[PDB]
């Protein structure tokens, strides 16, 4: 009776549809109270029905009355009563924390933090579990409004729990402390503060420190390590290092695992200053000014600290210093051995010479021990019995070979000669390569996965080295393993092949002679690109796990550009192919579906893409099985999204409109029309994306019923898809309106099963609660359907939609509240239509040199208003960002068309909310102010042609003069200001000079240089005197900026816009070469740092190209001769004292 | 009335699949398809017919692939042939050719998989006739597998006809563009070997064969070795071919090596 | 090859046999050594060595030589060289084929892996096959089958490797290292290990008769319903494994023997017809070198194409040139397999005198007793046991067996419902064949006629195929009653209505329905001319005109050779008149000029035989 009571009360809430009413608010509040009261009984079924009706009323009431719900939730969170009810209300408030407006954020924070400390003090276990789940989402939603002392007292409250005996409360305090300081206000200052506190807890280690607290502080440090990337200094990190090097030899079975976990995750993703002090020769000396022998601590000279680290770790845990013997499992645990091997593996990966060091610095006790051993029996642990040790040594030998072949520049013989002269170990890399081969054929799955990760770390460093033969042997020994009894082994095999460029593999095949035999004297070719592409990846699309099919599609996308099919009309040999690959790196508004550009296009990418689509489509057509059709539709949707069919149109062509191409639309348009394919959505939405792309890619050839299409043989296809799409959307309408059943699916007996599946998945969505989800079937399906309808509707016309606009708008009147991001874009695109709208001398020298010389030769020279009002209210109530951007683009396109502004016929509260957003942008409160602000400014400047432009300039100056980094906020704010003021009387001139002075303030950034290109291109057309004066001003501003290295031209696109500026600059401005040589012959303050050298040389290149192009030779020789430019400017001694200094 | 009977027969078919007998489960799938033909459905009757055909070809695979038995004589081959004929006829009444072509491709693969190549080549050429306007890459792949069938059943002049039809189609749709280059490479090697195998008179010699034998009287080593092989065969020089095959073995696939061995036999 | 059909002065001498098998060892060692230390030998040298080894293991005397204990090293050398050659064609580097000394234990596993390869790699038309160069698949298939019946490995390879997965390992010894005892039956109550065992006894055949009684007793020890139906299929295969004619049980040198239902011809064997037989023998020898399917033939030599029909106690083998038109027209030329019409009731009426190396009599009697106890049970086992008795009923040498067969099948028709088309198609040829061995009396002929008249109106197509085979079996030899022949010409209306409808496009409808349909049609034209009107003969000559005048992908080559062999069978008999012959002459002179070679060849043989009747 109580279960039926809570259920019929939930029904009485959800059946209201009478919102924004005070008695409705009171019954809603008391209903929320009794709902959380239904979840307090000590029984399973009543708690479950309470949980589901509470999640139902939360998610169904999330649209209209949001903050009353969270107000009641906070009012029950403040009670601190039963553990179950507090757990439930707290995790639901954490999941609803990111739906608040930023206006009411600070009262919720100042009301929430004492109860946060109260639940932090709670000793219930699952309360600590939901606390660890709840804190990071809250402080991601609420962090950037808190002052420093509030975060400090929060951190002190969480640090006060680090002495407990339970591991759950320790993990909660650790993860919550790191999660608060990650988001807080100034993350570097809080990192330095927390390192200070957590090392103040471990002031000198020659004391008792309550070893549970040691495990807790090491877990905090393990969480704190990946985030370090006033600043935290290097002495703090070397104190962390000496801490975790002391705490490896403590007598406990848990503190050694915590210490090795910290050390391993420190060596994996290291902080860079600690990295430079660790790889240094003397190292820690410059920072201060089972063991039976002298290892030598990490403060002596002439030996890197990683050498002592590897020596101490290996001599302490996994080796006996008398004989090449395994240490038993009796004294040391085996997960200790696995963690120690991963630690020493990453320590080899940073500095490989440590693996060749003698483990004992002094020869130890020659009477009892005849020989000494090095750290070379570390690779004797493949023969260890336990799995996850042999794979640890597999990963060790893999990263060892990769760190040798990338530490030294592939000069293996000289490097091994230096080491063999220094240290006495006889060791080559073909003594662990057969061991890494032997591990790949082992029985258990975990050692196979670890050996496959070893090949992933190892193989493309191997095959481009002098040991490429063993690299081919490793590729084949991996290739035999596509059919083991695990999904992780399969996805790891298939992720090793997506990091092999087969141009180098084909070169090594053609160069090899007797490796085509291999074992057992085979005869014939060894077609690795065919035995990999056609046999492993397209075949492993036919697995049953969607994990393996999805990662197979990802590996196809990565394997397209590196295939090298034989005898293309571009790259012919393999050596021309690899030379092309390395030369192109080192040496040099319609929807998303279409384009109208001529689009000059690569050739071998067209051949590889046509080959791969021929193979995938051949497997899609003749698929005898079931899962292969989903696995190929995923891969074809992904090959259309990565490689566009409007850009790579000659790749997808299969002669259907032969002579911009349709491609394989017909097979897909059959595949949707069946009755077994739309039963699952996880490939049905992908097939809708592919059908939309393959019908949209034939636009600009075809266009010049559906009279704009122009090609009659294409007409019904679109019709079918278009009709099918409307049917699908009608189904989704009848999901969100609980109504049992042109676009109509009443008589069609296949769509009723679809409606059943959608209703079941929507019930599974309404029962559980998880908001920020990417893999959402029904929402993702509505997104893909509306996306493809938007893409198709650009080909429509008023004769095509003029009898069907009202039912599409009626369908969009319902499905708005589910996913309004890609739902309003359908309204935008529908409103668009309703108003009319090769021989290695060519590749390595000659073609780039003629590009360069041609560059220098050129360088010498009316029903929409309910949905509209609903969208405006949805924008004023939301916090999701892409929704805001899309509503602003809808308003931009609506104001571009000459409509009256009767949408705010009474008030202007919309622009008041816009300026209130400007305020929280300017102080820095807003979480995702980046991708919303240029659309706000574009909307404002589009409004201004009837609010005056100086208000926009004042808001821009308020953003600029007091705010955060300009490359996200300030520059894209100024961009539509510039683009819609220069390109499109005296007051305009004053705004022009104010805007260009604001541009002059920000010259250090290169998008500002793109803006300045637009400036000079517009003013050179108008008047040449103002052009010349402005070029003189920008030249004598910009040249001492280049001289003192204060320009950020580190990017190549930055240097490109700098060179196009010096092309577009007036020649009369650079006509005296005194400033062009005073800013040329400069020396930086310190060229020890890399980016200083890069900015210096990029400035020198940027002026040297002008010295080559714009002026001649005798002029700059006379200009040097009149000045005193000494040739000893950068002597070898000068660079020596600069790299020292 | 009839939907509950269709769901009952489907449940019976799933139960018999779990029991794994499979003539009777496909017979209940024919009952499903007939009950859905009693109403006006379209594709679901085709789905029931195709699943019955999948079960029949699975049972004959279990009776000749997994069990190469001397007593089996192909009863569910005939049953799957009748059911899939009804399925492709329902598709042709509906108007969707690509699905029916996929069904005939499945028939052709299951028929080639038993050691009976002639009807496999016939149904492959039917499935490639059913894909001529729509998907010419599918037509070329069906014709290539048809050529391998007719080369298995030793209708060499049929393989010559289907190879010159493949080169005609890929030239007409190939500007080569992509995989059409792979088609041209395989067809140009096998049409040369299939012209040296059966040496035609100049009366029946189509002008396309005159073009290829004018070109001969694609990778470089293969073009050079095959051009030398045309010269060594029109010379009729034995030791030339005996040393040419040992160099030409890895550059060709299996069936092209079968054609080249047939060339070497019919000059010796 | 040639030693199979020569007189006794030209057979090989017995003293040289050791040297010949040593030469086979030597040429396979030369192939292996040249694969090791150079490039490939050639296609000619490899095909020569493999052909010599296959034919050396095909002969009885040489196989008895290689099965001795003095040459065990030579047999291991053959296994190692053949597995090395097969792994040096289809096994790419870093892959496998599928996913007491030491060399004997290597060789037994070698042969077992090769037999599972024969399941997987070396079958024609397969996907996995596509690396082997397709002129080696019958050769390597026959050499693995003929190698796996060596007494070294036969005790090993009949054990499926699922037993070697489980814990079964006795101690073998038979003067060989591998002389394993027989597999215990408690494992065989699993499904997949019994599937591998029936596969081994299928593709391996048998040996000296003790192995036959061993597998017979264990297969009866098998006798959940999946196990029963698999045991029924295995027992059909095991009883049919003694029907293979020349060496009696080896799948290498043999196939299912067949008896002709067509009579020996009258227009031949005169002073004029012998030259015509010579000319047709040459033209059909070249046709069988072109069109035919090499199931008997394991090499590339074109001069060998034989037929398994014995003399008629079974006598010698008939040479192929003596049987110019004896082969039944239902058979695709050269394919040697079960096709429902292997035995003719002529043969069992005159082989065993009844007119209205293993004892298979006791095996058949036990099968009848077990099946009659199983009939009087789920439907799957019932349908498959009716198929079982339909298959195995060719072995029966007593009329009482067919009498109990007929009464059990009529009772099974009485007790089973009529909504079972699968049991109907397995039932109708068995019932008409049981009627065919006995005399065609009134209470015999009336229910089978009502049965065929009902089952021709079905919706299931192999029910129609079995109906036409029942039509064929009732029209063979029994002098049909004057009331019994009155229910014939409804089948003539069936022949007209289903040859006029598939006149134009033939490949789309079916492949064997139309084939056996016109086969029984030609038998009806031949053996009962006066029963049906001659307008049926004129209409079927015009319908076969629409048959042969079609395009190449309209009427396939098997239908072409079937219809042409049937029309030539009609011409060799003197039953037809002259105007039908003249229409066939104008048909043939129209159809010689088609550009396909073997169609032109057989039409040229037709135009040969047109000008030899007059």
From Swiss-Prot, chain B:
The keyword Membrane does not apply. It is found in: Cytoplasm; Nucleus; Early endosome; Nucleus, Nuclear body. Disulfide bonds: none annotated. GO terms for biological process: negative regulation of proteasomal protein catabolic process; vesicle cytoskeletal trafficking. The keyword Cytoplasm applies. Keywords: Acetylation, Cytoplasm, Endosome, Nucleus. Its main location: cytoplasm. GO terms for cellular component: early endosome; nuclear body; nucleus. It comes from the Eukaryota. Produced abundantly in a wide variety of cell types. InterPro entries: F8A (IPR039494), TPR-like_helical_dom_sf (IPR011990). PANTHER family: 40-KDA HUNTINGTIN-ASSOCIATED PROTEIN (PTHR16797:SF4), FACTOR VIII-ASSOCIATED GENE 1 (PTHR16797). RAB5A effector molecule that is involved in vesicular trafficking of early endosomes. Mediates the recruitment of HTT by RAB5A onto early endosomes. The HTT-F8A1/F8A2/F8A3-RAB5A complex stimulates early endosomal interaction with actin filaments and inhibits interaction with microtubules, leading to the reduction of endosome motility. It is linked to Up-regulated in brain tissue from patients affected by Huntington's disease (at protein level). In a Huntington's disease mouse model overexpression of F8A1/F8A2/F8A3 impairs proteasome activity leading to the accumulation of mutant HTT and causes defective mitochondrial functions. Interacts with HTT (via C-terminus). Interacts with RAB5A. Found in a complex with F8A1/F8A2/F8A3, HTT and RAB5A; mediates the recruitment of HTT by RAB5A onto early endosomes. This is 40-kDa huntingtin-associated protein. It comes from Homo sapiens. The gene is F8A1.
Swiss-Prot record, chain C:
Coiled coil: none annotated. Expressed in the brain cortex (at protein level). Widely expressed with the highest level of expression in the brain (nerve fibers, varicosities, and nerve endings). In the brain, the regions where it can be mainly found are the cerebellar cortex, the neocortex, the striatum, and the hippocampal formation. A motif (Nuclear export signal) lies at residues 143-152. Interacts with PFN1. Interacts through its N-terminus with PRPF40A. Interacts with PQBP1. Interacts with SETD2. Interacts with SH3GLB1. Interacts with SYVN. Interacts with TPR; the interaction is inhibited by forms of Huntingtin with expanded polyglutamine stretch. Interacts with ZDHHC13 (via ANK repeats). Interacts with ZDHHC17 (via ANK repeats). Interacts with F8A1/F8A2/F8A3. Found in a complex with F8A1/F8A2/F8A3, HTT and RAB5A; mediates the recruitment of HTT by RAB5A. The N-terminal Gln-rich and Pro-rich domain has great conformational flexibility and is likely to exist in a fluctuating equilibrium of alpha-helical, random coil, and extended conformations. Belongs to the huntingtin family. It is linked to Huntington disease: A neurodegenerative disorder characterized by involuntary movements (chorea), general motor impairment, psychiatric disorders and dementia. Onset of the disease occurs usually in the third or fourth decade of life. Onset and clinical course depend on the degree of poly-Gln repeat expansion, longer expansions resulting in earlier onset and more severe clinical manifestations. Neuropathology of Huntington disease displays a distinctive pattern with loss of neurons, especially in the caudate and putamen. Lopes-Maciel-Rodan syndrome: An autosomal recessive neurodevelopmental disorder characterized by developmental regression in infancy, delayed psychomotor development, severe intellectual disability, and cerebral and cerebellar atrophy. Additional features include swallowing problems, dystonia, bradykinesia, and continuous manual stereotypies without chorea. Some patients manifest seizures. This is Huntingtin. It comes from Homo sapiens (Human). The lineage of its organism: Eukaryota, Metazoa, Chordata, Craniata, Vertebrata. The chain holds residues 2230 to 2929 of 3142 of the full protein.
């Amino acid at each position: 009776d109580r279960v039926n009571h809570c259920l019929t009360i939930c029904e009485n809430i959800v059946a209201q549809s009478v919102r924004n009413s005070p008695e409705f608010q009171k019954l809603l509040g008391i209903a929320m109270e009794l709902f959380l009261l239904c979840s307090d009984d000590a029984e399973s079924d009543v708690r479950m029905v309470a949980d589901e009706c509470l999640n139902k009323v939360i998610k169904a009431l999330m649209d209209s009355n949001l903050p009353r719900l969270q107000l009641e939730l906070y009012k029950e969170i403040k009670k601190n009563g039963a553990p179950r009810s507090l757990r439930a209300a707290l995790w639901r408030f954490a999941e609803l924390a990111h739906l608040v407006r930023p206006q009411k954020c600070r009262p919720y924070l100042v009301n929430l933090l004492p109860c946060l400390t109260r639940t932090s003090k709670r000793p219930e276990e699952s309360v600590q579990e939901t606390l660890a789940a709840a804190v990071p989402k809250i402080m991601a939603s609420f962090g950037n409004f808190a002052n420093d002392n509030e975060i400090k007292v929060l951190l002190k409250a969480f640090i006060a729990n680090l002495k407990s005996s339970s591991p759950t409360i320790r993990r909660t305090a650790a993860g919550s402390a790191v999660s608060i300081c990650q988001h807080s206000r100034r993350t570097q200052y809080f990192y330095s503060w927390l390192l200070n506190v957590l090392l103040g807890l471990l002031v000198p280690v020659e004391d008792e420190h309550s070893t549970l607290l040691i495990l807790g502080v090491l877990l905090t440090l393990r969480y704190l390590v990946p985030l370090l990337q006033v600043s935290p200094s290097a002495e703090q990190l070397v104190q962390v290092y000496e801490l975790t090097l002391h705490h490896t030899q403590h007598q406990d079975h848990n503190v050694v695992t915590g210490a090795l976990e910290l050390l391993q995750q420190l060596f994996r993703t290291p902080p860079p200053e600690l990295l430079q002090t660790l790889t240094a020769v003397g190292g820690i000396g410059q920072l201060t000014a089972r063991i039976k022998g002298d290892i030598g601590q990490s403060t002596d000279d002439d030996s890197a600290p990683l050498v002592h680290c590897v020596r101490l770790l290996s001599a302490s845990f996994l080796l006996t210093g008398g004989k090449n013997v395994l240490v038993p499992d009796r004294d040391v645990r085996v997960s200790v051995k696995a963690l120690a091997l991963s630690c020493v593996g990453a320590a080899v990966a940073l500095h490989p010479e440590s693996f060749f060091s003698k483990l004992y610095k002094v020869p130890l006790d020659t009477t009892e021990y005849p020989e000494e051993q090095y750290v070379s029996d570390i690779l004797n642990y493949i023969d260890h019995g336990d799995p996850q040790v042999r794979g640890a040594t597999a990963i060790l030998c893999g990263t060892l070979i990769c760190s040798i072949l990338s530490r030294s520049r592939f000069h293996v013989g000289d490097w091994m000669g230096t080491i063999r002269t220094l240290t006495g170990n006889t060791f080559s890399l073909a003594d662990c390569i057969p061991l890494l081969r032997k591990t790949l054929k082992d029985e258990s799955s975990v050692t196979c996965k670890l050996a496959c990760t070893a090949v992933r770390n190892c193989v493309m460093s191997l095959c481009s080295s002098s040991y490429s033969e063993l690299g081919l042997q490793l590729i084949i020994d991996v290739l035999t393993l596509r059919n083991s009894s695990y999904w992780l082994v399969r996805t790891e095999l298939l992720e090793t092949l997506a990091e092999i460029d087969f141009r180098l593999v084909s070169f090594l095949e053609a160069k090899a002679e007797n490796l085509h035999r291999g074992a057992h004297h085979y005869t014939g070719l060894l077609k690795l690109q065919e035995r990999v592409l056609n046999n492993v990846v397209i075949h492993l699309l036919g697995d049953e796990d969607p994990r393996v099919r999805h990662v197979a599609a990802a590996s196809l996308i990565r394997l397209v550009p590196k295939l090298f099919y034989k005898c293309d009309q571009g790259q012919a040999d393999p050596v021309v192919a690899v030379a092309r690959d390395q030369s192109s790196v080192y040496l040099k508004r319609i929807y998303r579906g279409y384009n109208l550009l001529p689009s000059i296009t690569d050739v071998t990418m067209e051949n590889n893409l046509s080959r791969v689509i021929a193979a995938v489509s051949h497997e899609l057509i003749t698929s005898t099985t079931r899962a292969l059709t989903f696995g190929c539709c995923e891969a074809l949707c992904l090959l259309s999204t990565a490689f566009p069919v409007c850009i790579w149109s000659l790749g997808w062509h299969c002669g259907v409109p032969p002579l911009c191409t349709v491609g394989m639309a017909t097979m897909i348009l059959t595949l949707l029309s069946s009755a077994w394919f739309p039963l699952d959505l996880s490939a049905h939405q992908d097939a809708l994306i592919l059908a939309g792309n393959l019908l949209a890619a034939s636009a600009p050839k075809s266009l010049r019923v559906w009279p704009a299409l122009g090609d009659r043989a294409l007409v019904p296809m679109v019709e079918q898809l278009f009709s099918h799409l409307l049917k699908v959307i009608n189904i989704c309408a009848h999901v969100l309106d609980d109504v049992a059943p042109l676009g109509s699916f009443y008589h069609l007996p296949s769509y009723l099963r679809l409606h059943d599946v959608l209703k079941a998945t929507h019930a599974n969505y309404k029962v559980t609660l998880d908001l920020q989800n990417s893999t959402e079937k029904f929402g993702g399906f509505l997104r893909s359907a509306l996306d493809v309808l938007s893409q198709i509707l650009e080909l429509a016309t008023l004769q095509d939609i003029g009898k069907c606009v009202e039912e599409i708008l009626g369908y969009l009147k319902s499905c708005f509240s589910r996913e309004p991001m890609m739902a309003t874009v359908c309204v935008q695109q529908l409103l668009k239509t309703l108003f009319g709208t090769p021989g290695l001398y060519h590749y390595c020298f000659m073609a780039p040199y003629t590009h360069f010389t041609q560059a220098l030769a050129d360088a010498s020279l009316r029903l929409f208003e309910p949905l509209v009002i609903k969208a405006l209210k949805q924008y004023t109530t939301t916090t999701c960002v892409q929704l805001q951007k899309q509503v602003l683009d809808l308003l931009a396109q609506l104001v571009q068309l000459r409509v009256n502004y009767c949408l705010l016929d009474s008030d202007q509260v919309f622009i008041g909310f816009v300026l209130k957003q400007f305020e929280y942008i300017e102080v820095g409160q807003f979480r995702e102010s980046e991708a919303i602000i240029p659309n706000i400014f574009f909307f404002l400047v589009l409004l201004s042609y009837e609010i005056g432009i100086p208000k926009i300039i004042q808001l821009c100056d308020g953003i600029m003069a007091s705010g955060r980094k300009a490359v996200t906020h300030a520059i894209p704010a100024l961009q539509p200001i510039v683009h819609d003021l220069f390109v499109l009387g005296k007051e305009l001139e004053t705004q022009k000079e104010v805007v260009v002075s604001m541009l002059l303030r920000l010259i250090q950034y290169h998008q500002v240089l793109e803006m300045f290109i637009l400036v000079l291109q517009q003013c050179h057309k108008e008047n040449e005197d103002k052009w010349k004066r402005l070029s003189r001003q920008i030249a004598d501003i910009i040249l001492p900026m280049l001289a003192k290295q204060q320009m950020h031209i580190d990017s190549h696109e930055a240097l490109g816009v700098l060179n196009t500026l010096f092309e577009i600059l007036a020649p009369s401005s650079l006509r005296p070469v005194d400033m062009l040589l005073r800013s040329m012959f400069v020396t930086p303050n310190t060229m020890a740092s890399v980016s200083t050298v890069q900015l210096w040389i990029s400035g020198i290149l940027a002026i040297l190209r002008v010295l080559i192009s714009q002026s001649t030779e005798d002029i700059v020789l006379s200009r040097i001769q009149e000045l005193s430019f000494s040739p000893y400017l950068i002597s070898c001694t000068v660079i020596n004292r600069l790299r020292d200094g | 009335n009839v939907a509950e009977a269709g769901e009952q027969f489907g449940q019976l078919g799933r139960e018999l699949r779990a029991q794994e007998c499979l003539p009777y489960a496909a017979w209940c799938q024919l009952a499903v398809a007939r009950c859905q033909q009693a109403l006006f459905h379209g594709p679901g009757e085709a789905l029931a017919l195709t699943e019955a055909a999948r079960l029949f070809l699975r049972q004959e695979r279990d009776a000749r692939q997994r069990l190469v038995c001397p007593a089996a004589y192909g009863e569910p081959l005939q049953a799957a042939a009748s059911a899939l004929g009804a399925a492709v006829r329902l598709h042709l009444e509906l108007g969707q050719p690509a699905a029916a072509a996929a069904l005939c491709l499945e028939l052709a693969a299951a028929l080639r998989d038993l050691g009976q190549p002639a009807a496999a080549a016939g149904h492959f050429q039917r499935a490639a006739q059913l894909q001529l306007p729509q998907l010419p890459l599918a037509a070329l792949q069906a014709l290539g597998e048809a050529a391998s069938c007719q080369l298995l059943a030793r209708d060499y002049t049929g393989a010559l006809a289907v190879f010159t039809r493949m080169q005609r189609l890929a030239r007409e749709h190939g500007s080569a563009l992509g995989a059409f280059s792979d088609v041209l490479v395989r067809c140009e090697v096998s049409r040369v070997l299939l012209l040296l195998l059966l040496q035609p008179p100049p009366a029946k010699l189509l002008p396309e064969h005159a073009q290829t034998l004018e070109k001969y009287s694609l990778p470089e080593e293969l073009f050079l070795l095959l051009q030398s092989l045309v010269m060594a065969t029109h010379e009729k020089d034995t030791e030339a071919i005996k040393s040419l095959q040992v160099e030409m073995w890895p550059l060709l696939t299996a069936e092209q090596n079968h054609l080249l061995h047939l060339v070497l036999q019919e000059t010796i | 090859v040639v030693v199979s059909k020569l007189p006794s002065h030209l057979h090989l001498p017995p003293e040289k046999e050791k040297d010949i098998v040593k030469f086979v060892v030597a040429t396979l060692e030369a192939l292996s050594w040249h694969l090791i230390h150079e490039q490939i030998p050639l296609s000619l040298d490899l095909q020569a060595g493999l052909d010599c080894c296959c034919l050396a293991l095909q002969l009885p005397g040489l196989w008895s030589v290689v099965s001795s204990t003095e040459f065990v090293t030579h047999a291991c050398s053959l296994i190692h060289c053949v597995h090395f050659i097969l792994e040096a064609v289809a096994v790419q580097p870093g892959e496998q084929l599928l996913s007491n000394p030491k060399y004997i234990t290597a060789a037994c596993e070698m042969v077992a892996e090769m037999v599972e390869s024969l399941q997987s790699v070396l079958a024609l038309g397969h996907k996995r096959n596509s690396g082997v160069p397709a002129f080696l698949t019958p050769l390597l298939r026959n050499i693995i089958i003929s190698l796996a019946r060596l007494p070294l490995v036969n005790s090993y390879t009949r054990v499926p490797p699922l037993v070697w997965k489980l814990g079964w390992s006795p101690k073998p010894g038979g003067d060989f290292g591998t002389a394993f005892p027989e597999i215990p039956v408690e494992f065989l109550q699993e499904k997949e290990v019994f599937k591998e065992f029936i596969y081994r006894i299928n593709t391996l055949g048998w040996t000296s008769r003790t192995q036959f009684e061993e597998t017979w007793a264990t297969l009866l020890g098998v006798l959940r319903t999946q196990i029963n139906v698999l045991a029924v299929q295995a027992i059909t295969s095991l009883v049919l494994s003694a029907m293979t004619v020349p060496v009696a049980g080896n799948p290498a040198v043999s196939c299912l023997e067949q008896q002709p239902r067509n009579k020996p011809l009258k227009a031949l064997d005169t002073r004029f017809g012998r030259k015509l037989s010579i000319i047709r023998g040459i033209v059909e020898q070249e046709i069988q070198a072109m069109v035919s399917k090499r199931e008997n033939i394991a090499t590339h030599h074109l001069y060998q194409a034989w037929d398994p029909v014995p003399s008629l106690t079974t006598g010698a083998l008939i040479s192929h040139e003596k049987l110019l038109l004896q082969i039944n027209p239902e058979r695709e030329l050269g394919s040697m397999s079960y096709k429902l019409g292997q035995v003719s009731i002529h043969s069992v009426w005159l082989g065993n005198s009844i007119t209205p190396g293993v004892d298979i009599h006791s095996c058949s009697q036990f099968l009848l007793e077990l099946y009659s106890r199983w009939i009087l049970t789920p439907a799957i086992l019932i349908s498959e046991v009716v198929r079982s008795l339909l298959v195995v009923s060719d072995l029966f040498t007593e009329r009482n067996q067919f009498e109990l067969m007929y009464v059990t099948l009529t009772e099974l028709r009485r007790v089973h419902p009529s909504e079972d088309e699968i049991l109907a198609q397995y039932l109708v040829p068995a019932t008409c064949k049981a009627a065919a061995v006995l005399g065609m009396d009134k209470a015999v002929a009336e229910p089978v006629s009502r049965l065929l008249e009902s089952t021709l109106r079905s919706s299931h197509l192999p029910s129609r195929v079995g109906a036409l085979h029942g039509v064929l079996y009732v029209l063979e030899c029994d002098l049909l009653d004057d009331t019994a022949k009155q229910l014939i010409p409804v089948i003539s209306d069936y022949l007209l209505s289903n040859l006029k409808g598939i006149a134009h496009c033939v490949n789309i409808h079916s492949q064997q329905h139309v084939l056996v349909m016109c086969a029984t049609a030609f038998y009806l034209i031949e053996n009962y001319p006066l029963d049906v009107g001659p307008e049926f003969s004129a209409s079927i000559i015009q319908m076969c005109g629409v048959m042969l005048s079609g395009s190449e992908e309209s009427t396939p080559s098997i239908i072409y050779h079937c219809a042409l062999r049937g029309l030539e069978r009609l011409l060799l008999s003197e039953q037809l008149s002259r105007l039908d012959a003249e229409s066939l002459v104008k048909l043939s002179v129209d159809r010689v000029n088609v550009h396909s070679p073997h169609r032109a060849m057989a039409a040229l043989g037709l135009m040969l035989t047109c000008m030899y009747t007059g």
